Amino acid sequence: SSPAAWNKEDFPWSGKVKDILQNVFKLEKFRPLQLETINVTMAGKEVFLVMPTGGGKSLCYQLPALCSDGFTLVICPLISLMEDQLMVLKQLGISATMLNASSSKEHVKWVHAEMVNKNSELKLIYVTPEKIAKSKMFMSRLEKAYEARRFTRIAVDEVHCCSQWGHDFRPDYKALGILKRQFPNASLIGLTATATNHVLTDAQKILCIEKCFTFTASFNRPNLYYEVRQKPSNTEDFIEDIVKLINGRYKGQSGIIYCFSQKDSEQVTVSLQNLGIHAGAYHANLEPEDKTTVHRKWSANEIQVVVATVAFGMGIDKPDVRFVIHHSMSKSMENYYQESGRAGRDDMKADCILYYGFGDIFRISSMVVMENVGQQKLYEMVSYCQNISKCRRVLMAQHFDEVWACNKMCDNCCKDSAFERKNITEYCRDLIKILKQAEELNEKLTPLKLIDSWMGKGAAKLRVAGVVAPTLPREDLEKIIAHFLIQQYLKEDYSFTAYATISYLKIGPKANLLNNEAHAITMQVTK
């Protein structure tokens, strides 16, 4: 059966739920699938929930814990994620406890007592997967509690870590199949944002589950404005453009700038600091003292903007982030979605602005070279950046394979422009003439060298007679080349050097389609 059959407040516990939500959580209504998922679990069945980060996954097992006798067991990989939740629960007045590596002997003793203590009001217990695999004592207390009917529910946070596809895999997550083996009458809930069908199918196996429901929540964050701008070639002009946003539409408001590297973050920070902006830097190499200093001042609005690498992400819940700017594109849609989704967690209007620069492809391509589908994921991101008609949300839904309602909340929906299919085939033929000549000369072309030759610039040996670039601006040429790349008419060829991975372009796999002289390459342009 489907979720719709569970969007119902028909159940013997619908009163107890609407009530706990409204008064214990102080929430007024259910977000999508939240009602449905609680019903399934209250119905004591197995369910997987796929829902964006910050979407409110936590509610869906914390609330059941409270509508039952005893506790709900919660499996969670990081101590910080657990501490995140318990603060919230302590503040709500809910009895929750967790256990650690560094947990106090007094605290462990008390927990053990509470689990079998029939009088315990402790309703949620958080533990790491190590505790399941490497504690005989804890397993025995769980067994006693299960037998005393005080233990009716299992929550597994971040269930994707089970799989060898799941880009956060953890060995200890493989032992967790023991739970439904030992506790078949304890219902299990699995939670994640990052769920491929074959990662869920595997977690379902690892955990020794069947049958199972799978509920997938939509990606959409309706208050978010999505825009892609051209990234300026000049780095000081790029800075000047930014300060004008922060001091114009975003004056006084909190926000984030995401950068490609740690150096990018340090440079841009300084640059903004000099121009008046209260900006702070966050990357992995940072002394963790400084990692914390920055979060504190930013969450407290002393700093207006954090300039950071992807290392700034885990456990960010600040609600009034009004803008997220991407100084460079992310490695993937999944990272972008995830990186930009930290904006507007107060559900009020917020801006998400990505600066697309040709050069950035190759810095990233080179970097994710060791990733199986690193390149494939990058090229998908580039194609987003290249799109000028399609609604930005329409493009995201294609990625999640979701049944795609924007209401002018992305740059392309606000355009009044028309479009048409421009035939750019000859530019490609022309560029392949250049590359063909280069190998006949045993010459390697960086993307820079190709463009120069096309423009009739660069080393004269690398130029091809009768090839004239059009009098289009450079950024248009960059877009035409990016196009052939991702279309694989061209391809990257990496070279590994003493210190760096660098990218070169070559005739790609699809160049043989041009053997058809009637072949047509078209690109959408404004009318």
Added chain:
Amino acid sequence: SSPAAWNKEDFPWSGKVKDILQNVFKLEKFRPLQLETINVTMAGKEVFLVMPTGGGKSLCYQLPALCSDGFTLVICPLISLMEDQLMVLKQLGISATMLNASSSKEHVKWVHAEMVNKNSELKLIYVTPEKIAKSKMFMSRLEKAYEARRFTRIAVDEVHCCSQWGHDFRPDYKALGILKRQFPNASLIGLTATATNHVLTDAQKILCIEKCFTFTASFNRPNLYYEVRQKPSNTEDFIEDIVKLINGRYKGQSGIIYCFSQKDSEQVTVSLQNLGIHAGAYHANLEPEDKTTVHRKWSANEIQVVVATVAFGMGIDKPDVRFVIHHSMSKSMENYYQESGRAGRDDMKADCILYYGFGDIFRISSMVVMENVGQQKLYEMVSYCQNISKCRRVLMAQHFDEVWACNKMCDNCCKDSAFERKNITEYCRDLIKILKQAEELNEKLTPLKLIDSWMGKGAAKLRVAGVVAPTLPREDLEKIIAHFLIQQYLKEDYSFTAYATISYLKIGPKANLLNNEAHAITMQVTK
């Protein structure tokens, strides 16, 4: 007495005058000083009229001719200027005639008869000064005509040719003093646009005149919009900027582009032709078949724009010229006014746009090297181009030294900006450090070489340690250097070479003011 005493329709001829204006000339009212000058001449007194070209000087002696017995004599240096007039008079039904070098025996015979024929209705005769000095026959007919009271008025066009200061001097204009000597009761009128007090003071002697009235018309053309834009470094970008005007604000309308040289003119023409514009080139070297070809089609609106050197100017009277663009600056304020003054001769709104480019100073500077006060005139032009606050009309009036009312009809009057005095002294000290070094190295610096060094570019020998240019754009640096030049803190130095005169910059006469370490150089900037 002054012109005001003559701005009056009190006279025995005024009724006849107003009537001839409206019903013969088809004109409704008098332009400034037109009334005053006619009155003086009708009263049989001597008057010099100084009035902008196209202001209507011709009316002021043609109309009296008709309000008098017999004919008015007109002295005119070019056959084209005479023919210009005669076409117009023929079109008005006025009996006018002229005499020439290539004049027919039949035509000469008939004229002599009309002059003494008491019944003649021939009211205007045009001749060259050659005719006065080198024709015994014509002078005798004049004498006979003067004695028969059929010859009451003398007009001398372009009276400035008399003087050794008037930049169109003609030797034959020195013989013309015989006229008031022989014909003291014929009144004389002198017309010119280009009149200095010492050119007037000289013509009054040559012509054997005293006393005399001098009426000076104001330069002002209330319908003209005056703007200075920055000229782009890229010449293809400069073309692109122009086409957007021509196809934008000036779509369908007639105009002129003025260029420094013939090559500039040929190039820009081709450049525009390729981009759809019906543009035509006019310079002195052109075969006169093509000189003529271009005027016909332009006047007939087949050509939208003439792209020309100063060679396109003498005898232009097209009324619906809606824009004049200066591709490069003129040699002098006097040339600019006159060149730009060809716009909007229908008195309806018209645009006058000058593209100021640093390099052009020196292209122009080098060429007028042989002119006494060429440079001084250029620097006056540069100082106009450099002004960002003052009303464009205010700056011009200072040049004609006239008692200066723009009504937002110049770019600077339309600005809402404020301004301030920026101290740029250290920049001068820094550039003088570079030049001192250059001469200590027996190196000559072109202006290009100076900027590069200042910018930390160019040949490394030519750079000075601890001299950092500011991070201002190049065009701003160009302006700072232009500023010191005309202020003579810097000066030009010309070198004569096989084929060309080239300019170098050197420390100028005013650099000794910086011996004062408290000395201050300031430049006006926007706030």
Added chain:
DNA sequence: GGATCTCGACGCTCTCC
């Protein structure tokens, strides 16, 4: 002679969690 071009040339910096 000034000025754009082209060639080897020497000078730096070398990607996330």
Added chain:
DNA sequence: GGATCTCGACGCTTCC
């Protein structure tokens, strides 16, 4: 190894 920098190389390019 890829851009930037720096150099002498030869070839080309003043109104009415």
